[PDB]
A paper describes a structure:
A recent study identified TMEM120A, also named TACAN, as an MSC that contributes to mechanosensitive currents in nociceptors. TMEM120A/B were originally identified as nuclear membrane localized protein that plays an important role in adipocyte differentiation. Here, we present the cryo-electron microscopy (cryo-EM) structures of both human TMEM120A and TMEM120B at overall resolutions of 3.7 Å and 4.0 Å, respectively. The cryo-EM maps of TMEM120A and TMEM120B reveal a shared homo-dimeric assembly, which is about 80 Å in height and 85 Å in width.
Author numbering:
A (entry chain B), B (entry chain A): 8 to 243, 268 to 338
């Protein structure tokens, strides 16, 4: 009849009463960590202030002073390295205030993961998502370049590209906030490629389009290729670059050649648009920045291998 | 000389030693909450299972049974309401697994705020951001519609729109995951408006453009207006709709009129594109869904006021 419902009801009564006891404990513990994070904020304060203070002290110690002062400054520098090391390792496990871009998108929400295992899991996903879409990019680009020629599909492709680049901005900005710091060219890169595909999204199907489309689609396929085989090197060290560097240089030069083709094509036919210049410029800037940063980084690693 | 540096160094030594003691305590407490959330998850399990079980029990009790069984089922339904109330109030303070869209963008990161004050602060920001951009939208749209007529600026405007709608998708999806549930038409709305501005981003500056542009820009200005004065009603209750409903209906009908203008304009001139149809359809679907949902909601509130 219904006595079974009555019995399971009676049981679940004290069950969820104990559950609510655990829940009160859990709420107390959530306010407890919150007040402990308030507390550590003072540790953050000392972290900045007294560090930078000893920094300026050593900075004012550079003048010529007795042997005692040079020896002391030596000891200070030999300790401050591990000092900042300790303090950064400390701060790494504290939820951090969002930056500017991530704030303007996600509002004011905390995203820090405060758990090394979580950081590894997150980066593994950040790589798998990159790979899967790099595959769908190669496929769609090649199909649009060979199997048919229709402006609608170029529009769809350029929309996929701008979406992909914006999503990578969001992802790698959480990653920057959360863990390692890749601050440098590899953000403006995405910022200058999305605007590129933008200004290419509005070509008025003239003749310049039928003279630039093939170069652009081939280059997109090949750049997607180098990103497709950039994953493997990240996963599995120095001997790897020995095969990657020729491909990276071939890519930089392919893109440089496209930029020149564009910046030149705007000089002979009956007319043109503004888009020829406004789309050739991104490419040149991409080449300059990318070549510059890659060579500087490989020189830094070469100099580290030197010593 | 340097003795001051030595003194402040000596002090900061035990200072940050105590800091590290607090830090060890804090780490222990973070693993403590983590294991407590593992625990409460069993509470989640019972929450789903035994609830739905008593649900199916009451469902099987609908048949005609003695007075004891109808009275008992009455007591069960009179308790289950507050039962689910308790259990949802409980679950509301548990970090939740991300959905589908937010997962495909932000990876696998937890965003729940687990603090009522945080929810209020977040929604207040979600409203202020909406307002500020609704202002910049009105301004730019009106300027593009009157002060000059140039296709570049229409492109910029449509890009601003698609960006804005995607950002609102992200924001309000974090909001859905975090607190109240607005599941319904007010997500596909943004999903069908971004694609609208998309398919309008690629008009080949024919004549159809010079016959549709004025209608579209006026309607954008007015829809931005109704969003600009939707904030105030949300902030400061039933007497408010008494003035808003005429504006909402005027807007729905303005958009219906644009959809008809488009779906018709594709029948007389020398030629057209596919964009006329692929852009008139969104508008019709917007009108249908929006009118439908608004009227259904106002009828629901009218029926709640009835009883």
């Amino acid at each position: 009849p219904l006595g079974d419902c009555l019995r399971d009801w009676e049981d679940l009564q004290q069950d969820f009463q104990n559950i609510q006891e655990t829940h009160r404990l859990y709420r107390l513990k959530l306010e407890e960590l919150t007040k402990l994070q308030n507390n550590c904020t003072s540790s953050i304060t000392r972290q900045k202030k007294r560090l930078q203070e000893l920094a300026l002290a050593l900075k004012k110690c550079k003048p010529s002073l007795p042997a005692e002062a040079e020896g002391a400054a030596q000891e200070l520098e030999n300790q401050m390295k591990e000092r900042q090391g300790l303090f950064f390792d400390m701060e790494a496990y504290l939820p951090k205030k969002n930056g500017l871009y991530l704030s303007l998108v996600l509002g004011n929400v905390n995203v820090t993961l405060l758990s090394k295992q979580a950081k590894f899991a997150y980066k593994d996903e950040y790589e798998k998502f990159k790979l899967y879409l790099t595959i769908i990019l190669i496929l769609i680009s090649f199909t649009c370049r060979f199997l048919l020629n229709s402006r609608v599909t170029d529009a769809a492709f350029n929309f996929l590209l701008v979406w992909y680049y914006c999503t990578l901005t969001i992802r790698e900005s959480i990653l920057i906030n959360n863990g390692s710091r890749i601050k440098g060219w590899w953000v403006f890169h995405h910022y200058v490629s999305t605007f590129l595909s933008g200004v290419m999204l509005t070509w008025p199907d003239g003749l310049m389009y039928q003279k630039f489309r093939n170069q652009f689609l081939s280059f997109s396929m090949y750049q997607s290729f180098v990103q497709f085989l950039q994953y493997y090197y990240q996963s599995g060290m120095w001997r790897g670059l020995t095969f990657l560097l020729p491909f990276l240089f071939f890519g930089h030069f392919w893109q440089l050649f496209n930029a020149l083709t564009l910046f030149n094509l705007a000089q002979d036919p009956q007319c043109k648009e503004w888009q020829v210049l406004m789309c050739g410029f991104p490419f040149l800037l991409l080449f300059l920045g990318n070549f510059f940063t890659t060579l500087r980084v490989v020189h830094h690693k070469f100099h580290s291998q030197r010593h």
